[PDB]
């Protein structure tokens, strides 16, 4: 039932070393509180 | 599931431990000083002078717009909230050889542990812009705050992927 999302510890890595030279990554989040970050970072 | 059930909790013991010794050890910062221009090993509250006839000789430093900054400084607060933080986060997680089951007794701690990294990110960056104001360099207390955040970001992780099973077996 957790996998009706996934950002797990690992993924939630991935996403910011891609986000940190642009590259981006594979997926990014929905939710608000999620969004805000990387709308940060 | 198993053996985390003791093993996560030990790091979270030396991180606190470590974090008080760089709130009082004069080890942070190398430089020349005054304790009436000798060499002197720099404290949050004091320097003290070696190399020199006072050699084991210590002095008090004061302070009393960026005037909340400065104040800050002369405060040195976020250590000790940081502290307090990661002890609550312990008190929470010491609890767990009784009341279990509820699962807010996992869940409710990894917010300490976030909040004393947190906090711990301001004091730095608090603490060396005011002491910038030159072959300076620094005292292993810096180094003992940094370890102290390494091993305090790890038990967030851990409460997560300790509490998480238990909310899975009742969500599916």
């Known amino acids: ?41 | 599931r198993g053996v985390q059930m003791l093993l996560t909790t030990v790091g979270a013991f030396a991180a606190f431990s470590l974090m008080t010794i760089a709130v009082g050890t004069d080890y942070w910062l190398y430089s020349r000083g005054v304790c009436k221009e000798v060499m002197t090993h720099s404290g949050l509250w004091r320097t003290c002078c070696l190399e020199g006839n006072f050699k084991g000789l210590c002095k008090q430093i004061d302070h009393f717009a960026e005037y909340f900054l400065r104040a800050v400084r002369a405060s040195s607060i976020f250590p000790i909230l940081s502290v307090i933080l990661l002890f609550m986060g312990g008190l929470c997680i010491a609890a767990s050889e009784f009341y279990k089951t509820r699962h807010n007794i996992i869940l409710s701690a990894g917010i300490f542990f976030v909040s004393a990294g947190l906090s711990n990110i301001i004091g730095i960056i608090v603490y060396i812009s005011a002491n910038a104001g030159n072959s300076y360099s620094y005292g292993w207390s810096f180094y003992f705050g940094a370890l102290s955040f390494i091993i305090a970001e790890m038990v967030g992780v851990l409460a997560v992927h300790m509490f998480i099973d238990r909310h899975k077996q009742l969500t599916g």
């Open chain 1, 1 to 41: 039932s957790e996998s009706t999302n996934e950002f797990g510890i690992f993924n939630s890595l991935w996403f910011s070393l891609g986000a940190f030279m642009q590259q981006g990554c594979d997926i990014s989040p929905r939710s608000l509180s999620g969004r805000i970050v990387g709308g940060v970072w």
